[PDB]
């Protein structure tokens, strides 16, 4: 007789998917949900490299960062994982890790002199250089601050004020010296105890030196606790001190804000990034989720340890 | 039903008729159709309402008591684990649901043809039905669109059916 049969479709696609029970099921059709393409390491916007210097080295003015000098705008700054130049005179940076988040949001700054090094009064600005922060063979100090010491055996109470007439946020940095012994304090500041009073429209702190002889790092037994703040447009901040003071000399006017984050790798500067730029690279392929790197930039597919995420769309391909 | 049809490229589910006029494939498009809308909606909900990958956490002060970020570090790592599991599992779940769904649609199309034909045809080992009567292209299309007329052919099918057994 005549025959009418019911049947399904078979193709040639062998892309296989895995199910909650059976696996490697050859389906007629399937989507790859996991973005696992060739990382593949002008164009759009161009990035910058912190070279042998760290973010601290890139902002503190570590003498050897004189190479870094010249990078005002960028798309994605590049830091080495263990740079040679961090904090040559041993110490810490208060809130460095939210300032790096701030710079995850900064694409261009303008560095300018907020306080002249010689305009701090009858105080020695031409001194205050260390071998830990030596520039070349010659010794030196951080370029964005000045290490003021006594003039003619007296270090008076100095006071200056900066008014952000720029109309934009200004990143300002300074620090307090924590000498190793009392004699270092007396030799540099010609008194036994000192203070640093920082007061802005909103900021308010009084710091005092903590004198103790920490183990030697780069040959120094003393420390320095550096601090940073954002002077908002219209704010007039005032610095007052009679010792143990790393004067601000240069500040950064945030010129442009956006979403340029940072990483710690050593690949060549890579521009023309896609929606998601990763350390390995930036692939245009837009599968819902990716798995190249956990540390990503821009709107990014979620990192997942998976190696295959193929969603079954067609039916079980079984030809003949 | 053992195997699929590379020749039926009209949809996932359908028919292969073979009569006096000849033999041909032709997909059942209402069912194919409902399956496509269903799997499309499933995929859309999976992709769109997937999860909030963006770390909306403000992290105003992050952690930082320990040298490296301590709490948000392991929080993010644990969230990574949470979906790394959920997504693998959801893929599996929905893929076997899709295969069981395709299987159910096939089963249902077959049962519809069976309920139409009843006595006027014989069931065959695999997916196929052999008529006890001559089913031209009009009769074939009547079966497909669901308008098969049993009393029309019931007498012819009766005579043939009772003849094959001597």
């Amino acid at each position, epitope marked *: 007789g005549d025959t009418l049969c019911i049947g399904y479709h078979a193709n040639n696609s062998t892309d296989t998917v895995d199910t909650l029970l059976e696996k490697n099921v050859t389906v007629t059709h399937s989507v790859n949900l996991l973005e696992d393409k060739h990382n593949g390491k002008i164009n759009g916007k161009q990035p910058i490299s912190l070279g042998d210097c760290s973010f601290a080295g890139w902002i503190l003015g570590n003498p050897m960062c004189d190479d870094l000098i010249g990078k005002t705008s960028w798309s994605y700054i590049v830091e080495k994982p263990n740079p040679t130049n961090g904090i040559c005179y041993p110490g810490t940076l208060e809130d460095e890790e939210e300032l790096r988040l701030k710079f995850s949001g900064v694409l261009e700054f303008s560095k300018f002199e907020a306080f002249t090094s010689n305009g701090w009064g009858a105080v020695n600005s031409g001194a205050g250089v260390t071998a830990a922060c030596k520039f070349g063979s010659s010794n030196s100090f951080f370029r964005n601050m000045v290490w003021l010491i006594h003039q003619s055996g007296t270090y008076p109470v100095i006071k200056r004020t900066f008014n952000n007439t720029k109309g934009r946020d200004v990143l300002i940095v300074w620090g307090i010296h924590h000498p190793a012994t009392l004699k270092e304090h007396q030799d540099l500041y010609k008194k036994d105890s000192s203070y640093v009073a920082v007061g802005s429209e909103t900021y308010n702190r009084r710091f005092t030196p903590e004198i103790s002889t920490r183990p030697n790092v780069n040959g120094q037994a003393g420390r320095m606790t550096f601090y940073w703040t954002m002077v908002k447009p219209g704010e007039s901040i005032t610095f007052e001190s009679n010792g143990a003071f790393l004067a601000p000399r240069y500040a950064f006017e945030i010129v442009s804000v956006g979403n340029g984050k940072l990483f710690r790798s050593e690949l060549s500067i890579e521009s023309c990034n896609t929606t998601c730029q990763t350390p390995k690279g930036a692939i245009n392929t837009s599968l819902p989720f990716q798995n190249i790197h956990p540390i990503t930039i821009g709107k990014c597919p979620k990192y997942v340890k998976s190696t295959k995420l193929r969603l079954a769309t067609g039916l079980r391909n079984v030809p003949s | 039903i053992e195997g699929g049809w590379t020749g039926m*490229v009209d949809g996932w589910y359908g028919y292969h008729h073979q009569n006096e006029q000849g033999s041909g494939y032709a997909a059942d498009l209402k069912s194919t159709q409902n399956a496509i809308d269903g799997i499309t909606n499933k995929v859309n909900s999976v992709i769109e309402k997937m999860n909030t990958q963006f770390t909306a956490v403000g992290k105003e002060f992050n952690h930082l008591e320990k040298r490296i970020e301590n709490l948000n570090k392991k929080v993010d790592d644990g969230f990574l684990d949470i979906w790394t599991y959920n997504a693998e599992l959801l893929v599996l779940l929905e893929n076997e649901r899709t295969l069981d769904y395709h299987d159910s649609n096939v089963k249902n199309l077959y049962e519809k043809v069976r309920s139409q034909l009843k006595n006027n045809a014989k069931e065959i080992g695999n997916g196929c039905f052999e008529f006890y009567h001559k089913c031209d292209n009009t009769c074939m299309e009547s079966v497909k669109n669901g308008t098969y007329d049993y009393p029309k052919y019931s007498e012819e099918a009766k005579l043939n059916r009772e003849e094959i057994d001597s």
Partner: antibody
Amino acid sequence: QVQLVQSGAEVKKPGASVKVSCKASGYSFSSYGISWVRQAPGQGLEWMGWISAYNGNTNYAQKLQGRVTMTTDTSTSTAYMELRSLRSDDTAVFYCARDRPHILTGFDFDYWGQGTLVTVS
Amino acid sequence: DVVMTQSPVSLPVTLGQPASISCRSSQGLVYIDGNTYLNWFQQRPGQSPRRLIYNVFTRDSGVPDRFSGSGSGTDFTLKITTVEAEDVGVYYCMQGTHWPYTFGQGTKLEIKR
């Protein structure tokens, strides 16, 4: 190459059947499909309907269901739209376009038609 | 059913000033093939329409590099650098993967704002 020739302009009264034709040349008829869209004066409407040369099959727009009948002549590679029960609101400029014939493939509107004015009053 | 909302119905664009057109969908427009489906197309007054973008990121062979199609998920855009003269016209969203597929409303361009 790109040759999608619609029918001539047509003028009728409400309640009469209308028939539009779209010719096509080249190797572009590989039993591929053809869809038709509506464009009301000044503002376009959504798709009207589609048909597959490979597998006789038609998808019609909603609330037109009952008036729209579409055909294909594979021998002349020609598609046909036929709207019954004409309305004054139906007065509009129609259009043809390419489409892929089996559902295993999706859709592609690579060509377009010369346009056919249809007036109903 | 699908709803294609186009927020920028009217667009006065100074020649040479890249502008964008936004299509927003009610549901997601991905498909079994894995390819999101919206194919932008343009129409000139008294001239039959012609498409420009294939899926979300393919340019029609006959499309200048100015016409760039973007978008992901449910919200999608179309930006044209240095908008030229013939670029003026009416634009439309495209088929949602759901058979009731919706062109949406229209968006018009101007020579120089």
